[PDB]
Amino acid sequence: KGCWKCGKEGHQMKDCTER
Ligand SMILES: [Zn+2]
């Protein structure tokens, strides 16, 4: 659904600002 590490779970992992 949301991210994989971001507990917030709202955006997409692909677009996640992990970098
Ligand atoms: Zn994220």
From TrEMBL:
User: CCHC-type domain: from which residue to which, for each copy?
Assistant: 3-18
Write down the superkingdom of origin. Viruses
Q: Where in the cell is it found?
A: Host cell membrane; Host endosome, Host multivesicular body; Virion membrane; Virion
**Residue ranges the record marks as coiled coil:** none
Look up the signal peptide feature and give its range. Answer: none
Q: Which family does it belong to?
A: Belongs to the primate lentivirus group gag polyprotein family.
- Name assigned to this protein: Gag polyprotein
Which species is the source of this protein?
Human immunodeficiency virus type 1 (HIV-1)
